[PDB]
Design a binder for these strands. Structure first.
Ligand SMILES: [Mg+2]
Ligand SMILES: [Mg+2]
Ligand SMILES: [Mg+2]
Ligand SMILES: [Mg+2]
Ligand SMILES: [Mg+2]
Ligand SMILES: [Mg+2]
Ligand SMILES: [Mg+2]
Ligand SMILES: [Mg+2]
Ligand SMILES: [Mg+2]
Ligand SMILES: [Mg+2]
Ligand SMILES: [Mg+2]
Ligand SMILES: [Mg+2]
Ligand SMILES: [Mg+2]
Ligand SMILES: [Mg+2]
Ligand SMILES: [Mg+2]
Ligand SMILES: [Mg+2]
Ligand SMILES: [Mg+2]
Ligand SMILES: [Mg+2]
Ligand SMILES: [Mg+2]
Ligand SMILES: [Mg+2]
Ligand SMILES: [Mg+2]
Ligand SMILES: [Mg+2]
Ligand SMILES: [Mg+2]
Ligand SMILES: [Mg+2]
Ligand SMILES: [Mg+2]
Ligand SMILES: [Mg+2]
Ligand SMILES: [Mg+2]
Ligand SMILES: [Mg+2]
Ligand SMILES: [Mg+2]
Ligand SMILES: [Mg+2]
Ligand SMILES: [Mg+2]
Ligand SMILES: [Mg+2]
Ligand SMILES: [Mg+2]
Ligand SMILES: [Mg+2]
Ligand SMILES: [Mg+2]
Ligand SMILES: [Mg+2]
Ligand SMILES: [Mg+2]
Ligand SMILES: [Mg+2]
Ligand SMILES: [Mg+2]
Lengths: 63, 203, 188, 245
RNA sequence: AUUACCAAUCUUUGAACGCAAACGGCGCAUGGGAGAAGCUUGUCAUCCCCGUGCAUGCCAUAUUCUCAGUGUCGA
RNA sequence: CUGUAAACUGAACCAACGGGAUUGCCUCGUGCAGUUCCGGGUCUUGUUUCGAGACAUCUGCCAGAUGGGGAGUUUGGCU
RNA sequence: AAAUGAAAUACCACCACUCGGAAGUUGCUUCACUUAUCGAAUGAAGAGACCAAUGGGUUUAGCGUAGUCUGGCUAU
RNA sequence: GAUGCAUCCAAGUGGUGUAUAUCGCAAACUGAUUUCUGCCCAGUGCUCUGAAUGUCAACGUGACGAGAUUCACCGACGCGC
RNA sequence: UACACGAGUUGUUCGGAAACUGAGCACAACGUUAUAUCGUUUUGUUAGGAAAGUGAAGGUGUG
RNA sequence: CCAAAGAAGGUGUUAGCCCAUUGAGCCAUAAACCUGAGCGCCUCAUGAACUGUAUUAAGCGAGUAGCACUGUUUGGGAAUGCAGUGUCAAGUUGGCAGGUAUUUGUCUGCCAAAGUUAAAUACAGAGUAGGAAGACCGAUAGCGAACAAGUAGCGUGAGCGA
RNA sequence: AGACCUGAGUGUGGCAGGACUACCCGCCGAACUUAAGCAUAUUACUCAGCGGAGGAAAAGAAAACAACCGUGAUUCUCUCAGUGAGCGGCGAGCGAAGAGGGAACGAACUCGUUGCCGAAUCGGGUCUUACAAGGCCUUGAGUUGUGGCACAAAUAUCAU
């Protein structure tokens, strides 16, 4: 709750990685049935593919 | 606190800001010697958790380690016997770079008790680990019970024997359960244990 | 690090205060500097001398008034929002050790100040170097000089918060290899 | 089997250039400030004979531009250069036969020996005896001169390289026939240790890919691949045109 | 006195560490101690002994023991 | 205009100043004695100088070909 | 919910389209950089700069276009 | 033609020819003069070439299935010719 | 020339070293190596800060 | 004679008695090691009855875990551990482990990537110190060596070796 | 014309190397042999090789086992077990683990984080019977954090 703030202020200056940047590239123009094929090969397992693909579309409604 | 913010910058290690810092600092590292004495550690967050206090008798080194798989040393690149061992380039050395880094610093600086090390930078050629070392005879280290233990003589070259965390990594420790039934306490302690031919007196 | 494309987060430290109010900012930090191990040990000594002569239950003493000059003590002065405004050093060797400092400030709306030298935040305080000084509550002898300092500095860091976070630095070419690029537009 | 004589030679144990009666490496004077923004005169004092080279080496002294000494330079001697010639090697130098005026400043169609490929390496090309290069083309927009190496293979070098003017001394060495194995003995005893050449077809099939058989024949085609491993890359290496023309 | 036990002496080397090395060789400091010619009965000239110190690496450290840097800044 | 360019034609040599300032002096005209810059062209965000240059070579990876250069092993039975 | 051929509407979530224009990533790519990298030379022995869109921010001084902490100001 | 070629080394800003610079180096063959050195490029070799010639490597691209995976494709230099 | 006992080798200048360089070696450093006892190393080392030989003001017996 | 006849040895031959031993203790020895401290003080901290009252933020280790490859390792088999490269997290609305891969769920245990830690265990190598034993060998045996044995002697040497 | 940063130089105060290696720890690492051949395999994660400590080393305080009525650091032992596990040209061969009875065991702890503190720390002195679990002077390290304290929406923390 308070550590989460520390991970959103450090996520503010730092910006998004070359994954999360290139993920939301797909997720910005359809490509969502394969944005998780990208953030699965790159990001290891497949349960953490959604929790980040769901976190970049939750980062797109917040432009 | 102060730690929460440095610890989270380094977890976002691939961003353009942290990767700029690493692109310039991986560049001075490539014009310094393999082993380099530092005054302060580059990562106080990651050093102070690995057992580094900024007292006297504590010293930090960058050690450079060439990347990539070890190549078997056979004359002319020729290996003999069974083709099990035919490969010359694809062996992997069964000891991670961080252990090799920690052991470079030990052969050189015999008056120091290496304690830990951590990742500082890697380019596509080299890889720098900052190895946290202790002067076991600075009076500060002597009279401080948090780190007296390393003055005792069983810790002279814990780096050379795989007693550091990096060594405890490639020793298959750090898995305790059914995952290390032959790893415990060591590859041979288990090997001696399973392959002794025990002879009870009364059989 | 002048050639490269300095990110808009690390650039923040190459747009420091000017010498106009920087000496003023070092004036406050200096007179509200901590006690130097000699007025510290004889301060808590009068906490026994006039307490051993006191009847009982009266030794109450604290730091008279100073600026929060550590790093993890400053960070808490910000998180608590009790630091009225914080001063930050231009350069610290693991630059990431203070990189995030000017960004949890406008998170908690503290006026921050990236100032030109940590070696000049040490001479005021007393140490050799200092990564960041925080100037919390002050006595009414000096609410005038800082109340303006907060204004003179957020006009440079908080008012600029939008353009700061979108500001790529560097790309500053040589005087040798960019006067060449002047002698060819001379050929135009 | 065993390693082959050619492979067993980059170890450089015995098969290593001798050079004890040799003078230093013969090369142009170092490309300092003086040979860029002017010239400097230098007197040729001694023309010696480095054992193992057909070209005369001329000991040229210059003055050290910065200290007070007289620095001494060993250079290969262009033919005609005699003792006491007052050689100029700079930018504004004249183009007499022996001077080292820069390559893009020499007139075109001229004759230059001891040219240097990179601007500063102190003379590499056209430096054996009688060998030389002809300047063909300057490209002042690119700043690179195309000179014709003494092998027909004409290349392009930068117009700031340096180059002597003339032909390297000792020309016509290769035309006097040796007439005896003993005059080949004394040629290579100043050079490295490769003489006599035993034919690989007269060797045993352990020491060379050609050796073996009841007859002295190369069993498989002599032309070997460019990519072939060392110890196999023997014979006509990547021969693209083969045999008498 | 012999025996037994428990503070010394402990040559030349050797990790060997002043340099070297098929040299019982060669120095640099630093004392002191011989020997003497001159010289003022003694006093230190080269010569010659004795002893200490002097290897590299590393750590700590020096009442403000010295420094380098177109690293940082300021008077 | 806009740039460092004061030099041998068959063996010579060139390396530690002139002036002005600063302090007293035989003083302030003249000077004897420490000192400072000038020049023999002021600053450089600043690479030692070039040259190539995000291409390379080759840093590391994998991949495909090639590969007696080399290794290991084999090279049945009958009669 | 009446009311059409070879096709059904106002409280509108939205997959309903040959093209038109920039944005934004991306490859393809040459153009110029240089700072990494590379090679060479060198006892690292003289590198570029008169000179102003050349950029530096130029402690500045204004002009719009602005954004504001909402008298500090900056950004373009 | 030197960021070369031949080559060493377990690896390295390592080493050899090379203190060299095509009148050179490396690599073969034949074997002094003289005299000639014929025909055969199918083969197997070297060699270039690859526009188109025929085909391939992970990588990269796509669609499939909830997902492991499937089905592709880029046919790309190479390898065929 | 065996065995035993006893003796016997005299240096300012002879040879050697102190004191040269050659073919070459390789301590250091540096690099590499799991690892070094590996490699580079006088035709001059080392990403490389590698040294009292001299000249001096001042100190000192004493009119 | 025996709380002593085996700590079974010595002595000119087979010894309980000739000698040395050995015993249950004592002058106890320094009480310089420590046995509970019987202590002894000089100082030093730190233990309770408490008046009022707060901590709150929970967070708890990143080129790490994981994944992909390919190399090794393992009984570990759609990976047991490791290594290398590419990739690279999550945050207790969690992570890992629950020996068949995958997705979707539940449940159970646990909380990696920091550190120390006795004992039981291995070893007769320094026998270092001290030993004690044997259905062992008995001088071609037992260690190579019962003795001036790693010796003499051999080998350029590594070594060999009576 | 000075601080700081990054480096030097010698002065002091030290340390490291070497020996030993039976056991132990890390890396490296075969082959003969077995498979009636042999290349997977086996030998063997062995010998040799490099390195490093100790009187033991190592391990060790659960990111453990289990699936039960649950167990509770490591190590060792008997046992599970030459295994109706399993790996394996599924051949030769290989091959553990939980549980159980034990030995041992007054065995647990401390950093970092977190919160509250913020130099109470460290080192050079000095003073005391050497008292450095302390006194009192010290910029000398240190604020780029030494040190102190607390352990959970549940407690009681916290000061006289
Ligand atoms: Mg150093
Ligand atoms: Mg260092
Ligand atoms: Mg250093
Ligand atoms: Mg650094
Ligand atoms: Mg320090
Ligand atoms: Mg341990
Ligand atoms: Mg077990
Ligand atoms: Mg052959
Ligand atoms: Mg052949
Ligand atoms: Mg020595
Ligand atoms: Mg000390
Ligand atoms: Mg000083
Ligand atoms: Mg400076
Ligand atoms: Mg046969
Ligand atoms: Mg005799
Ligand atoms: Mg060596
Ligand atoms: Mg008897
Ligand atoms: Mg945890
Ligand atoms: Mg196996
Ligand atoms: Mg890995
Ligand atoms: Mg995960
Ligand atoms: Mg699971
Ligand atoms: Mg799932
Ligand atoms: Mg779920
Ligand atoms: Mg732990
Ligand atoms: Mg006998
Ligand atoms: Mg640094
Ligand atoms: Mg310093
Ligand atoms: Mg010393
Ligand atoms: Mg050594
Ligand atoms: Mg040792
Ligand atoms: Mg067999
Ligand atoms: Mg095995
Ligand atoms: Mg062994
Ligand atoms: Mg232990
Ligand atoms: Mg059994
Ligand atoms: Mg096995
Ligand atoms: Mg039990
Ligand atoms: Mg702490």
């Amino acid at each position: 709750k308070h550590l989460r703030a520390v991970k959103a202020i450090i996520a503010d200056l730092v910006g998004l990685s070359p994954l999360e940047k290139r993920v939301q590239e797909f997720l910005r123009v359809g490509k969502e049935k394969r944005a998780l094929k990208y953030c699965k090969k790159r990001l290891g397992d497949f349960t953490a593919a959604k929790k980040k693909r769901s976190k970049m579309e939750e980062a797109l409604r917040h432009t | 606190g102060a730690f929460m913010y440095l610890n989270e910058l380094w977890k976002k290690k691939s961003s353009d800001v942290m990767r700029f810092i690493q692109r310039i600092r991986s560049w001075e590292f490539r014009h310094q010697h393999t082993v380099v004495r530092l005054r302060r550690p580059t990562r106080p967050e990651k050093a102070r958790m690995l057992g580094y206090k900024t007292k006297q008798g504590f010293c930090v080194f960058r050690v450079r380690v060439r990347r990539g798989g070890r190549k078997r040393p056979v004359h002319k690149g020729i290996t003999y016997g069974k083709p099990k061992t035919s490969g010359v380039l694809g062996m992997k050395l069964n000891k991670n770079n961080q252990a090799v880094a920690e052991q470079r610093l030990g052969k050189r600086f015999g008056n120091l008790r290496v304690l830990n090390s951590y990742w500082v930078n890697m380019d596509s050629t080299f890889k720098w680990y900052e190895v946290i070392a202790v002067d076991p005879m600075c009076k500060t280290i002597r009279r401080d019970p948090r780190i007296n233990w390393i003055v005792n003589s069983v810790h002279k070259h814990r780096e050379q024997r795989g007693l550091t965390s990096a060594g405890r990594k490639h020793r298959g420790l750090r898995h305790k359960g059914h995952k290390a039934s032959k790893l415990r306490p060591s590859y041979r302690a288990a090997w001696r244990r399973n392959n002794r031919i025990v002879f009870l007196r009364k059989r | 690090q002048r050639r490269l494309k300095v990110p808009p987060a690390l650039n923040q430290f190459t747009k420091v205060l000017d010498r106009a109010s920087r000496n003023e900012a070092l004036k406050l930090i200096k007179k509200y500097a901590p006690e130097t191990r000699k007025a510290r040990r004889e301060r808590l000594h009068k906490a026994a001398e006039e307490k051993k002569k006191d009847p009982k239950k009266t030794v109450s003493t604290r730091a008279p008034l100073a600026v929060v000059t550590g790093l993890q003590e400053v960070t808490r002065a910000i998180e608590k929002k009790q630091a009225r405004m914080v001063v930050i050093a231009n350069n610290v060797d693991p630059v990431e050790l203070v990189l995030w400092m000017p960004n949890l400030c406008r998170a908690n709306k503290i006026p921050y100040a990236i100032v030109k030298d940590m070696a000049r935040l040490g001479d005021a305080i007393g140490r050799k170097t200092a990564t960041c000084v925080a100037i919390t509550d002050v006595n009414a002898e000096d609410e005038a000089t800082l109340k303006n300092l907060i204004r003179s500095v957020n006009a440079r860091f908080l008012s600029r918060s939008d353009v700061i976070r979108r500001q790529w630095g560097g790309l500053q070419l040589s005087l040798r290899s960019r006067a060449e690029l002047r002698k060819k537009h001379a050929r135009n | 089997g065993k390693t082959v004589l050619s492979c067993r030679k980059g170890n450089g144990s015995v098969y290593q250039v001798h050079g004890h009666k040799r003078l230093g490496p013969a090369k142009l004077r170092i490309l300092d400030y003086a040979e860029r923004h002017g010239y400097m005169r230098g007197v040729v004092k001694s023309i010696e004979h480095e054992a193992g080279r057909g070209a005369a080496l001329a000991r040229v002294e210059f003055r050290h531009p910065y200290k007070f000494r007289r620095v001494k330079e060993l250079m290969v001697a262009p033919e005609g250069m005699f003792t006491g010639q007052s050689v100029f090697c700079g930018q504004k130098a004249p183009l007499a036969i022996g001077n080292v005026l820069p390559l893009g400043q020499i007139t075109e169609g001229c004759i230059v020996c001891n040219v240097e490929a990179k601007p500063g390496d102190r003379g590499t090309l056209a430096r054996a005896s009688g060998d030389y290069c002809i300047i063909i083309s300057h490209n002042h927009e690119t700043g690179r001169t195309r000179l014709k190496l003494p092998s027909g293979q004409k290349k392009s070098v930068p117009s700031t390289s340096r180059a002597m003017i003339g032909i390297i001394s000792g020309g016509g060495r290769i035309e006097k026939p040796v007439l005896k194995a003993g005059n080949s003995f004394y040629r290579f005893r100043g050079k490295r240790n490769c003489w006599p050449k035993v034919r690989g077809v007269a060797r045993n099939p352990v020491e060379h890919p050609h050796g073996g058989g009841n007859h002295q024949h190369i069993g498989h085609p002599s032309t070997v691949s460019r990519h072939s491993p060392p110890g196999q890359k023997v014979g006509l290496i990547a021969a693209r045109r083969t045999g008498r023309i």
